[PDB]
Structure 1
Amino acid sequence: MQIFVKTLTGKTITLEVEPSDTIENVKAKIQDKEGIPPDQQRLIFAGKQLEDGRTLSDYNIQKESTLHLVLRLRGG
């Protein structure tokens, strides 16, 4: 299924994911696509900061949901 990941300034990507995928795996997908280290990725959904060991389905993340990514400095 596809989800959206948007930075706080509104730069958007999609990812191809499954409900059981861990947050750690989502961050590795972001690193693959955009080159951002997982340790620079603070991800937020429905007001909650996401924990590596939990799954998309643990947060009720579904098809065409939007996650926010708090990136401090591209290339930093």
Structure 2
Amino acid sequence: MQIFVKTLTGKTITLEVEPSDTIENVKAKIQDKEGIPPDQQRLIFAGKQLEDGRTLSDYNIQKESTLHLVLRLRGG
């Protein structure tokens, strides 16, 4: 199924996933499309941060749902 991952920079990333996909696998899929290492990714759905070791079904993510991707980056 398709889900949408929205960044704080306006970009929308479409991903092909299964409900049984682990959060680590979803992060690895994002790296293959955008090149962001999984250590930099924060995934958010329904105001909750997705924890590693769980699957998308644990958060009741359906087809064409929208996640948010905050990146662990900073500047000075």
**TM-score (norm. length: structure 1):** 0.91
User: Which aligned runs of 4 or more in structure 1 are off by greater than 6 angstroms?
Assistant: none
Tell whether the 8 Å contact from 2:31 to 2:37 is kept in structure 1 after alignment: yes
Tell whether the 8 Å contact from 2:42 to 2:72 is kept in structure 1 after alignment: no
| Shift of residue 58, structure 1, vs aligned partner | 0.2
Q: Quote the Cα distance in structure 1 between the aligned partners of 2:8 and 2:34.
A: 16
**Percent of residue pairs identical:** 100
| Shift of residue 52, structure 1, vs aligned partner | 1.2
| Shift of residue 73, structure 1, vs aligned partner | 4.5
- Indicate the structure with greater strand content: 2
Structure 2, gaps ≥5 residues long: none
Cα 1:54–1:75 shift into 2, 3 Å: farther
Cα 1:25–1:70 shift into 2, 3 Å: same
User: Cα deviations across residues 10-45 of structure 1 (Å, max 9, x unaligned)?
Assistant: 210100000000000000000011000000000100
Query: How many corresponding residue pairs?
Result: 76
Structure 1, gaps ≥5 residues long: none
**TM-score (norm. length: structure 2):** 0.91
2:14 matched to 1:14? yes
Q: Quote the Cα distance in structure 2 between the aligned partners of 1:62 and 1:12.
A: 17
| Shift of residue 74, structure 1, vs aligned partner | 9.8
